[PDB]
Ligand binder design. Structure first.
Ligand code: CHL
Ligand code: CLA
Ligand code: CLA
Ligand code: CLA
Ligand SMILES: CCCCCCCCCCCCCCCCCCCC(=O)O[C@H](COC(=O)CCCCCCCCCCCCCC)COP(=O)(O)OCCN
Ligand SMILES: CCCCCCCCCCCCCCCCCCCC(=O)O[C@H](COC(=O)CCCCCCCCCCCCCC)COP(=O)(O)OCCN
Ligand SMILES: CC1=C(/C=C/C(C)=C/C=C/C(C)=C/C=C/C=C(C)/C=C/C=C(C)/C=C/C2=C(C)C(=O)[C@@H](O)CC2(C)C)C(C)(C)C[C@H](O)C1=O
Ligand SMILES: CC1=C(/C=C/C(C)=C/C=C/C(C)=C/C=C/C=C(C)/C=C/C=C(C)/C=C/C2=C(C)C(=O)[C@@H](O)CC2(C)C)C(C)(C)C[C@H](O)C1=O
Ligand SMILES: CC1=C[C@H](O)CC(C)(C)[C@H]1/C=C/C(C)=C/C=C/C(C)=C/C=C/C=C(C)/C=C/C=C(C)/C=C/C1=C(C)C[C@H](O)CC1(C)C
Ligand SMILES: CC1=C[C@H](O)CC(C)(C)[C@H]1/C=C/C(C)=C/C=C/C(C)=C/C=C/C=C(C)/C=C/C=C(C)/C=C/C1=C(C)C[C@H](O)CC1(C)C
Ligand SMILES: CC1=C[C@H](O)CC(C)(C)[C@H]1/C=C/C(C)=C/C=C/C(C)=C/C=C/C=C(C)/C=C/C=C(C)/C=C/C1=C(C)C[C@H](O)CC1(C)C
Ligand SMILES: CC1=C(/C=C/C(C)=C/C=C/C(C)=C/C=C/C=C(C)/C=C/C=C(C)/C=C/C2=C(C)CCCC2(C)C)C(C)(C)CCC1
Ligand SMILES: CC(=O)/C=C/C=C(C)/C=C/[C@H]1[C@H](C)CCCC1(C)C
Lengths: 99, 73, 41, 219, 192, 165, 192
C-alpha cells in the first residue's frame, strides 16, 4: 500500500528535522542536567575506567547547532522505527477496531 | 554523548511534600557499591521468574506432546 | 469472705468461668437454633 | 443539680450536669464523656427527634383520619409502593436522587453550622440572605428564617421550657417510630389496628403472642 | 479572593491573591509553591483546551454536521474526513504526522520560555491589547470559563459512555422528562 | 445463579443427598424397637436432618454441582442477588462483637493502668469494673470513632520506644 | 411610614422612611443594610415584571387571542407561534436564543450600574420626565401596584393549577355562582 521509499524517507527526514530544530533545546537541557554517569561521586572515567572515556568524534562538530553524528543516528533510528511501524500496520488487512 | 544517567533519574524521583522523604537520593551508590544488594535483587527477580515459568508451562505448554506427558509436567 | 471473692477473681478462675459461660451459651444457642449456616433474619 | 434523674438514688455522671434540655443523667454506656462527642450527639438527637416527630405525625394523623372516614390514605408500609404503581409516578431512583441532592446542600450547610455556629452568616455568602443564617449560639437552634413566629423569644427561661418540651416530644416520637417498625414487622397491621386489637384482649393480644418477638424454637 | 466554595470554612493562605480563587484545595495539593505554579499554568492551559473542545463539540452538532464521537469514524473505516461538508484528502497516518509535528513545534516553543510567558504571553497573542487594562478580572473570567468547559467536556464523555447519545440529544431528552430522564434513570450510573 | 451455581431448591444433587442421609438413618433405625431410647434418638436425628435440608432449600442458598451449599463473599453481588446473609451480615455481626470485646479489654487495661499496682489488677481482675466496662463496650463503634476524631485513641510515635535501628 | 401592617405591633426602625413601607419584616430579612438595598431593588424589579405579566395575561385573554397557559402550546407538538392573530416564523431554539441574548445584554447593562441606578434610573428611562417633583408618592404607588400584580400572577398560576381554567373563565364561573364556585369547592385548596 504505502511506498516504502517515500514513507521511510519522509519519516527519517521528519525525525531529523524535529531533533535538529524542535527537540534540540530540550534535549540539550536534559543532557546538561543529567551529565555523564557518575559512581561514588565521580564519572566512570575518573574512577579508573579507561573504556568509559567519551569519544572524541562527538566532542565537537562543524554543525552550528552542535548536532553530532550520534544525534543523526538516534533520530534516524526513531524515524525508521516509525516508518516501518506505519508500513507494517498498513500492510495488514484485518479489522483491529473495537467497534 | 546521549543516554540517561541512573544517578540523576534516582535523585529526581523525589515526590514533593516529603511523603517519601529524600526519595531515592544516594540509592545509585547504595546499589552499585554493595554486591549483596545486587545479588538480593537478582535473586528476587530470578525466583519470581522461576515461579512464572512454572505457572506458564503447565497452562500454556510450549513443547510438542508435553501436555500428554503427565509425569514430565 | 473477702479473700474467697478475691481468689475467685483471679485470672485462671475468671478465665475458666468465662470460657464455661460462653461455651454454655453457644451450646444452648445451637441446641435451640441448630444448623445456622447463614444469618437468615 | 438536684433536678429529677432517670434512676432515683443514682448520681448523675459529671460529664452531663444539668444544662442541656432533657438532661436526666441517663448515660449508662458513658457515650457522651467527650465534650465534642457530646455536642455531636446532642445535635444528632435533635435531628433524629425532629425527623421522627414529622414521620410519626405523618403516619398517625393520616391513619386516624382514615379510620374515621375522611381522607383515605394507605398504610405507611404500603404508601411507598402505592405511589409507585401510579400513572405519572416518578421513578424511584430519580426521586431518591433528587431528594438526596437537595438534602446534600441543606445538610452540608447545617454541618458547617455545627462546626462553627456563625459560619453561614458570612457576609456575601448568599444573595443577602446570609444575615438570617446566624444561629443563637448553640448548634441546632437557628432563629432568623426559622422560628418565624418568634416563640420563646420573650425570655431565656421561656426558651428553655420549650426546648425541654421539644426534646421530650422528640424522644417519645423516636420510641414510637421504633415501635411502629417492630409492630409492622411482627404483625402485618397498622398502629391503630394493633392498638384496637390489644384493648380487645390485652392478655391474649400482645408481643408475647405475635409469634415473632418470642422465638418458637424456645417454646 | 471573591468566593469561598464553602461559606463556613477556612481556606489555605497560598490561594488568597490568585485570580479566580475560591480557596478550594481540600487535599492540599498546591501546598508547595513549585507545585502551585505548575498547577496554575496547567489549569489555565487545560481550561483553554477544554474551551476550544467544548466549542467545537457544540458547533459540529448545532450546525448539523454530526456529533464529536462519530467524527473520526469515516476516517478509520476506510474513507476521508469531512469538514463543513468538503472531503479532506488526508488519512490517519498523514493527519497524525502533521498534527504531531505542528504540536511538537508549538509546544516546544511554548515550554521553552519563561514561567510567566508559558501561560500569559501577551507579546503577540494579544493583538487587541485587552491585557493592558484590568487583567485580573479578565484572567478570572478566563479561568472560570475554562473550568466550566472542562466540566462540560468530562460531562460529554461520561454521558456518551453511559447512554450513547450526544450532547444536544441528551439535553433534549432530559428536558422532555426531567423527573424520569437523567443519570439516575440509566442503568449505568446507579448500581440498581 | 451467580457463578454458574444452581439454587439448592432445584438442585437434584441436594435432594439426592438428603434422601441418602435419611435412608442411612432409617436403615440404622430398622435394627431397633418402635418406642425404645435408640429408636427415639434416631427418629429425632431424622427429623433434624429433614428440617436442616428444608431450611437450607427455603433460605435460598446456592448449591454447586456437588449438591452442597456455597457462600457468596462479595458486596453488591450478594446484595443484588439476595445473599447478604452469607458473609456480609455475618461480617458486620462479627466485627461488632469482636470490637465490643476488644474495646472492653482496652478500657479495662487503661483504667487499671492508672492504679498504683496495675500488675495485680491484671492477674486479679476487678469484677465490678470489668462488668461495667463490658457493658460500656457495646457502644464501642461510637466511642472508637469519637476517640479517633478526638486524637486520644493513638499514641505519639515520639513517645513509643523503638529499636536502635 | 403610612401603615402599620399589624395595628398594634412595633415595626422595625430601618423601614420607617422607605416608600410603601408598612413595617412588614417579621423574619428580619432586611436587618443588614446591604440585604435591605438588594431586597428593595429586587422588590421593585419584581413588581414591574409582575405588572407587565399581569397586563399581558389579561390582554391576551380579553382580546380573544388565547390564554396564557396555552400560549406556548402550539409551538410544541409542531410549531408556529401566533401573535395578534398573525404568525411568527420562529422556532423554540431561535426564540430562546434571541430572548437569551436580548435579556442578557439588557440585564448585564442594568446590573453593572450604580446601586441606585439599578432600580431608579432616571434620564433616558423617563421620556416624559415626570420623576422630578416629589417622587416618593409615585414610588409608593409603583411598589403597591407591583405587589398587587405579584399577587395576581401567583393567583393565576395557583388557580390554573387547581381548577384548570384561565382567569376570565374562572372569574365568570365565580360570578355566576359565588356561593358554590370558589376555592373551597375544588378538592385541592380546602381539603377538610
Ligand atoms: C410583559 C411580558 C409579556 C410576555 C412575555 C408576552 C408573551 C406573549 N404574548 Mg403578550 N406578552 C407580554 C405582554 C403583553 N402582551 C400583550 C398582548 C398580547 C396579545 C393580544 C397577544 C399576546 C401574545 C403573546 C405571545 C406571542 C409570542 C410573541 O412574543 O410574539 C412576538 C411578539 C412581539 C414581537 C412583540 C413586539 C412588541 C414591540 C414591537 C413593541 C407570547 C407568549 C399572543 C398570543 O398569546 O398568541 C397566542 C397574542 O395574541 N400578547 C400585552 C398588552 C395587553 C402585554 C402587555 O404587557
Ligand atoms: C543504520 C545505518 C543506516 C543508514 C545511514 C541509512 C540511511 C538511509 N536509508 Mg536505511 N535502513 C537501515 C539502515 C540505515 N539506513 C536498516 C538497518 C534498514 C532495515 C530496516 C533500512 C531500511 C531502509 C529502507 C527500506 C529505506 C531506507 C532508506 C534510506 C535513505 C533515506 C533517504 C531519504 O530520506 O529519502 C528521501 C526523503 C524524502 C523523499 C522526503 C538513507 C540514505 C530509504 C531509501 O532508500 O531512500 C530512497 C528506504 O526506502 N533504509
Ligand atoms: C473461623 C472458623 C469458623 C467459623 C467462621 C465457623 C462458623 C460456623 N460454625 Mg464452626 N467450627 C470451627 C470453626 C468455625 N466455625 C472449628 C474449628 C470447629 C471444630 C471445633 C467447628 C465446629 C462446628 C460445629 C460442630 C458446628 C459449627 C457450626 C457453625 C455455624 C454456626 C453458627 C452459629 O453458631 O450460630 C449463631 C451463633 C450466634 C449468633 C452467637 C453470636 C454471639 C456470640 C455469643 C458472640 C461470642 C463473643 C465471644 C457457623 C457458620 C454449626 C453448624 O450448624 O454449622 C452450619 C455446628 O454444628 N462449627
Ligand atoms: C475486596 C475486594 C473486592 C473485589 C475483588 C470486588 C469485585 C467485584 N465487585 Mg465489589 N465491593 C467491594 C470489594 C470488592 N469487590 C467492597 C468492599 C464493597 C463495599 C463498598 C463492594 C461493593 C460492590 C458493589 C455495589 C458491586 C460490586 C461489584 C463487583 C464485581 C464487578 C465490579 C468490578 O469489579 O468492576 C470494576 C471496578 C472498578 C473500580 C472499575 C466484581 C467481581 C458489582 C457487582 O455486583 O457486579 C455485578 C456491584 O455493583 N462490589
Ligand atoms: C519521531 C518519529 C518520527 C516522526 C516523523 C513525523 C514527521 C514526518 C512524517 C512524514 C510521514 C510520511 O511522510 O509518510 C506518509 C504517511 O504519514 C504517516 O503515516 C506517507 O504518505 P502516503 O504515501 O502513504 O500517502 C499517499 C497520499 N497520496
Ligand atoms: C424597550 C426598549 C428600551 C430600550 C432603552 C435602552 C436605553 C439604554 C440607555 C441607558 C443609558 O443611557 O445609560 C448610559 C450608560 O452609559 C453607557 O455605558 C452607554 C450604554 C448605552 C448603550 C446603547 C443602547 C442602545 C440600544 C438601545 C436599543 C433600543 C448612561 O449612563 P447611566 O448608567 O448613568 O444611565 C443614565 C441614563 N439616563
Ligand atoms: C427474678 C430475678 C431476676 C430477673 C431479671 C430479669 C428477667 C429482667 C427482665 C427483663 C425483661 C424485659 C424480661 C421479659 C420477659 C418476657 C417473657 C415473655 C419471657 C418468657 C416467656 C416464654 C419463654 C414463653 C413463650 C411462649 C411460646 C414460645 C409459645 O409457644 C406460645 O404459646 C406463646 C408463649 C407462651 C409466650 C434478677 C436477675 C433481678 C435476680 C434473680 O436472678 C431473680
Ligand atoms: C472538538 C472535538 C474534540 C476535542 C477537543 C479537546 C482538546 C477537548 C478538551 C478536553 C480537556 C482538556 C478536558 C479537561 C478536563 C479536566 C477535568 C475533568 C478536571 C477536574 C478536576 C476536579 C473536578 C477537582 C480536583 C481537585 C482539586 C482542584 C483540589 O483542590 C484537591 O484538593 C481535591 C480535588 C477534588 C481532587 C475531539 C478530539 C473529541 C474530536 C471531535 O470530533 C471534535
Ligand atoms: C440514650 C442512650 C445513651 C446510653 O448511654 C446508651 C443507650 C441506652 C444506647 C441510649 C439509648 C439510645 C436509644 C433509645 C436510641 C433510640 C433511637 C431511636 C429510636 C431513633 C429513631 C429515630 C426515628 C426516626 C428518625 C424516624 C423517622 C421516620 C420517618 C421520617 C417516617 C417516614 C415515613 C412516613 C412519614 C410515611 C411513609 O408512608 C413511610 C415513611 C417513609 C417511613
Ligand atoms: C486570545 C485573545 C487575545 C486577543 O487580543 C483578543 C481575542 C481574539 C478575543 C483573544 C481570543 C480569545 C478566544 C479564542 C476566546 C475563545 C473562547 C472560547 C471558545 C470559550 C468557550 C467556552 C465554552 C464553554 C464555557 C462551554 C461550556 C459548555 C457547557 C456549559 C455545556 C453544557 C452541556 C453539557 C455539559 C451536556 C448537555 O448534554 C448539553 C450542554 C447543556 C450543552
Ligand atoms: C416580604 C416578606 C418579608 C417577611 O419577613 C417574610 C415573607 C413573608 C417571606 C415576606 C413576603 C414574601 C412574599 C409575599 C413573596 C411573594 C412574592 C411573589 C408572589 C412574587 C411573584 C412574582 C410574580 C412574577 C414576577 C410574575 C411575572 C409574570 C410573568 C412574567 C408572566 C409572563 C407571561 C405572560 C405575560 C403571558 C404569557 O402568555 C405567559 C407568560 C410567559 C407566563
Ligand atoms: C551534512 C550537511 C547537511 C545534512 C545532511 C544529512 C541530513 C544527512 C543525513 C543522513 C541520514 C538519513 C541519517 C539517518 C540515519 C540513521 C539511520 C538511517 C538509522 C537506522 C536504523 C534502524 C535503527 C532500524 C532498525 C530496524 C530494523 C533494523 C528492522 C525493522 C525494525 C527497525 C526499524 C527497528 C546539510 C545539507 C543539511 C547542511 C550541510 C551539509
Ligand atoms: C446563569 C449564569 O451562568 C450566570 C449568571 C450571572 C449573573 C446573574 C451575574 C449577575 C450580576 C451580578 C449579581 C454581579 C455583577 C455582574 C452582574 C451581571 C450584574
Amino acid at each position: 500500500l504505502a511506498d516504502v521509499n517515500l514513507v521511510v524517507g519522509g519519516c527519517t527526514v521528519g525525525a531529523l528535522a524535529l531533533g535538529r530544530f524542535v527537540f534540540l533545546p530540550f534535549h540539550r537541557a536534559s543532557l546538561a542536567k543529567a551529565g555523564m554517569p557518575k559512581q561514588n561521586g565521580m564519572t566512570h572515567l575518573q574512577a579508573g575506567d579507561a573504556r568509559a572515556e567519551e569519544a572524541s568524534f562527538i566532542l565537537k562538530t562543524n554543525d552550528p547547532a552542535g548536532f553530532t553524528v550520534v544525534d543523526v543516528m538516534a533520530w534516524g533510528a526513531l524515524g525508521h522505527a516509525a516508518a516501518f511501524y506505519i508500513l507494517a500496520t498498513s500492510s495488514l488487512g484485518l479489522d483491529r477496531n473495537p467497534f | 554523548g546521549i543516554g540517561h544517567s541512573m544517578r540523576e533519574i534516582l535523585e529526581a524521583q523525589t515526590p514533593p511534600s516529603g511523603s517519601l522523604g529524600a526519595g531515592h537520593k544516594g540509592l545509585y551508590d547504595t546499589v552499585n557499591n554493595s554486591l549483596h544488594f545486587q545479588l538480593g535483587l537478582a535473586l528476587a527477580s530470578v525466583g519470581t521468574i522461576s515461579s512464572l515459568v512454572a505457572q506458564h508451562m503447565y497452562s500454556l505448554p510450549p513443547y510438542a506432546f508435553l501436555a500428554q506427558d503427565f509425569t514430565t509436567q | 469472705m473477702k479473700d474467697f471473692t478475691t481468689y475467685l477473681s483471679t485470672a485462671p478462675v475468671l478465665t475458666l468461668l468465662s470460657v464455661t459461660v460462653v461455651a454454655g451459651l453457644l451450646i444452648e444457642i445451637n441446641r435451640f437454633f441448630p444448623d445456622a449456616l447463614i444469618a437468615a433474619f | 443539680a438536684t433536678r429529677p434523674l432517670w434512676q432515683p438514688g443514682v448520681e448523675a455522671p459529671k460529664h452531663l450536669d444539668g444544662t442541656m434540655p432533657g438532661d436526666f443523667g441517663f448515660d449508662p454506656l458513658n457515650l457522651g464523656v467527650n465534650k465534642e462527642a457530646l455536642n455531636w450527639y446532642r445535635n444528632a438527637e435533635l435531628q433524629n427527634g425532629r425527623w421522627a416527630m414529622l414521620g410519626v405525625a405523618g403516619i398517625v394523623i393520616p391513619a386516624e383520619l382514615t379510620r374515621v372516614g375522611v381522607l383515605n390514605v394507605p398504610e405507611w408500609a404500603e404508601a411507598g409502593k402505592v405511589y409507585a404503581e401510579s400513572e405519572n409516578a416518578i421513578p424511584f431512583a430519580s426521586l431518591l436522587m433528587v431528594q438526596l441532592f437537595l438534602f446534600n446542600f441543606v445538610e452540608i450547610k447545617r454541618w458547617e453550622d455545627i462546626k462553627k455556629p456563625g459560619s453561614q452568616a458570612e457576609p456575601g455568602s448568599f444573595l443577602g440572605f446570609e444575615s438570617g443564617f446566624k444561629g443563637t449560639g448553640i448548634s441546632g437552634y437557628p432563629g432568623g428564617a426559622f422560628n418565624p413566629f418568634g416563640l420563646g423569644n420573650s425570655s431565656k427561661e421561656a426558651m428553655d421550657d420549650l426546648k425541654w418540651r421539644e426534646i421530650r416530644n422528640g424522644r417519645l416520637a423516636m420510641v414510637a417510630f421504633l415501635g411502629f417498625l417492630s409492630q409492622h414487622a411482627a404483625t402485618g397491621k397498622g398502629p391503630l389496628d394493633n392498638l384496637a386489637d390489644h384493648l380487645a384482649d390485652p392478655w391474649g393480644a400482645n408481643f408475647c403472642s405475635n409469634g415473632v418477638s418470642i422465638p418458637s424454637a424456645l417454646g | 479572593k471573591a468566593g469561598n466554595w464553602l461559606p463556613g470554612s477556612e481556606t489555605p493562605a497560598y490561594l488568597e491573591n490568585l485570580p479566580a480563587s475560591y480557596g478550594f484545595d481540600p487535599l492540599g495539593l498546591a501546598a508547595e509553591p513549585a507545585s502551585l505554579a505548575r498547577f496554575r499554568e496547567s489549569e489555565v492551559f487545560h481550561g483553554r483546551w477544554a474551551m476550544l473542545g467544548a466549542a467545537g463539540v457544540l458547533g459540529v452538532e448545532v450546525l448539523g454536521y454530526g456529533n464529536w464521537y462519530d467524527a473520526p469514524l469515516p476516517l478509520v473505516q476506510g474513507g476521508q474526513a469531512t469538514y463543513f461538508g468538503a472531503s479532506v484528502p488526508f488519512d490517519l497516518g498523514t493527519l497524525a504526522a502533521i498534527e504531531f509535528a505542528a504540536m511538537a513545534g508549538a509546544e516546544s516553543f511554548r515550554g521553552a520560555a519563561e514561567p510567566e510567558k508559558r501561560v500569559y504571553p501577551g507579546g503577540a497573542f494579544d493583538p487587541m491589547g485587552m491585557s493592558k487594562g484590568n487583567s485580573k478580572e479578565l484572567k478570572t473570567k478566563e479561568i472560570k470559563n475554562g473550568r466550566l468547559a472542562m466540566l462540560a467536556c468530562l460531562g460529554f464523555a461520561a454521558q456518551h459512555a453511559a447512554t450513547g447519545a450526544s450532547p444536544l440529544e441528551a439535553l433534549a431528552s432530559h428536558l422532555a422528562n426531567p423527573m424520569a430522564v437523567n443519570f439516575a434513570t440509566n442503568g449505568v450510573s446507579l448500581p440498581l | 445463579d451467580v457463578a454458574g451455581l444452581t439454587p439448592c431448591s432445584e438442585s437434584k444433587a441436594f435432594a439426592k443427598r438428603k434422601k441418602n442421609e435419611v435412608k442411612a438413618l432409617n436403615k440404622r433405625l430398622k435394627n431397633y424397637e418402635a418406642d425404645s431410647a435408640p429408636a427415639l434418638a434416631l427418629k429425632a436425628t431424622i427429623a433434624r436432618t429433614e428440617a436442616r435440608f428444608d431450611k437450607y432449600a427455603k433460605q435460598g442458598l446456592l448449591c454447586g454441582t456437588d449438591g452442597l451449599p456455597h457462600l457468596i463473599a462479595d458486596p453488591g453481588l450478594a446484595l443484588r442477588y439476595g445473599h447478604a446473609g452469607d458473609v456480609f451480615i455475618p461480617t458486620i455481626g462479627f466485627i461488632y462483637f469482636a470490637g465490643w470485646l476488644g474495646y472492653a479489654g482496652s478500657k479495662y487495661l487503661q483504667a487499671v493502668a492508672a492504679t498504683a499496682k496495675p500488675i495485680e489488677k491484671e492477674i486479679i481482675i476487678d469484677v465490678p469494673l470489668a462488668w461495667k466496662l463490658l457493658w460500656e463496650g457495646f457502644g464501642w463503634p461510637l466511642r472508637a470513632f469519637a476517640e479517633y476524631k478526638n486524637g486520644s485513641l493513638m499514641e505519639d510515635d515520639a513517645k513509643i520506644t523503638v529499636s536502635p535501628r
